[PDB]
Symmetry: C4
């Protein structure tokens, strides 16, 4: 009734979190590319 | 459950926003990757 | 009631579509890194 | 009623198996970027 209706708000709030740990992993990921790129422009 | 329904949606449209920036960013990632990779092929 | 209640399953169907794009994109990069990784060792 | 609310929760936990496979996948990218970035720092 309402009790699965939070087995819904609950699971979800855990999805925003899981999403956020992802974005900052995208960022870590990018950082390492910009840099790794810059070492290649220069090693030339 | 009428107004928590309402909350649920709001939070969902927020969750797509996020899944969107993610999607943008992977596109960028992938081009840098190919860009990076081309140069390894030049040298 | 049911109105807002599918402005919900609507989102989810759309959410999971995107979670599918990424997983295949991710798949693409994972083997572009492997290509670059393989070569660096060659360029050595 | 409960019928569609039941669906809702399903495809939601479906998405958590997904994003979980995904993190496990961007982790494995990150290890390759480190390891790639280390290898140049040497040449
Ligand atoms: Ca990535």
């Amino acid at each position: 009734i309402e009790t699965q209706m939070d087995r819904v708000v609950k699971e979800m709030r855990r999805q925003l979190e899981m999403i956020d740990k992802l974005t900052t992993r995208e960022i870590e990921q990018v950082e390492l590319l910009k840099r790794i790129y810059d070492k290649l422009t220069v090693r030339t």
